[PDB]
Design a protein around this ligand. Structure first.
Ligand SMILES: COC[C@H]1O[C@@H]2O[C@H]3[C@H](O)[C@@H](OC)[C@@H](O[C@H]4[C@H](O)[C@@H](O)[C@@H](O[C@H]5[C@H](O)[C@@H](O)[C@@H](O[C@H]6[C@H](OC)[C@@H](O)[C@@H](O[C@H]7[C@H](OC)[C@@H](OC)[C@@H](O[C@H]8[C@H](O)[C@@H](OC)[C@@H](O[C@H]1[C@H](O)[C@H]2OC)O[C@@H]8CO)O[C@@H]7CO)O[C@@H]6CO)O[C@@H]5CO)O[C@@H]4CO)O[C@@H]3CO
Ligand code: NI
Length: 55
C-alpha cells in the first residue's frame, strides 16, 4: 500500500548484467535480491534488499 517503495542506505555498483547500480538516497520501486525500478534513472534490475529501507 506503500511498502513497495524504498530508499538506498548505501551506494551499490552493479556486478553483472542483471543488477542495478544505485547511490545512497536513490529511491527504488519494487516490481534477498529484489527486482526494482530506479526512480532516478528508470532502469529496472535486481538489487540487494538489505541495501534499501522503506521510503
Ligand atoms: C522531455 O520533456 C518532455 C516531457 O516533459 C515532462 O516529462 C518530465 C516528467 O514529468 C518528469 O517526471 C517527474 C521528469 O522525468 C523523469 C522521469 O520521471 C524519470 O523516471 C527519469 O526518466 C528516465 C526514464 O524512466 C527511462 O525510461 C529513460 O528514458 C529514456 C527512454 O528510454 C526508455 C528513451 O526511449 C528516450 O525517451 C524518448 C521517448 O521514447 C520512449 C519518446 O517517446 C515518443 C519521446 O518522449 C516524449 C513523450 O512521449 C511526450 O509525452 C507527452 C513528452 O514528454 C513530456 C512529458 O509529458 C512531461 O511530463 C510532465 O515529450 C517527450 C520528449 O519528446 O522522447 C523521449 C526522449 O528522447 O529517452 C529517455 C530519456 O533518456 O531515461 C529517463 C532519464 O533517466 O528521468 C526523467 C527526467 O530526465 O522529467 C521529464 C522531462 O524531462
Ligand atoms: Ni505498500
Amino acid at each position: 500500500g506503500s511498502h513497495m517503495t524504498f530508499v538506498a542506505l548505501y551506494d551499490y555498483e552493479s556486478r553483472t548484467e542483471t543488477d542495478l547500480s544505485f547511490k545512497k538516497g536513490e529511491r527504488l520501486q519494487i516490481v534477498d535480491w529484489w527486482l526494482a525500478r530506479s526512480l532516478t534513472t528508470g532502469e529496472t534490475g535486481y538489487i540487494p534488499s538489505n541495501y534499501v529501507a522503506p521510503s
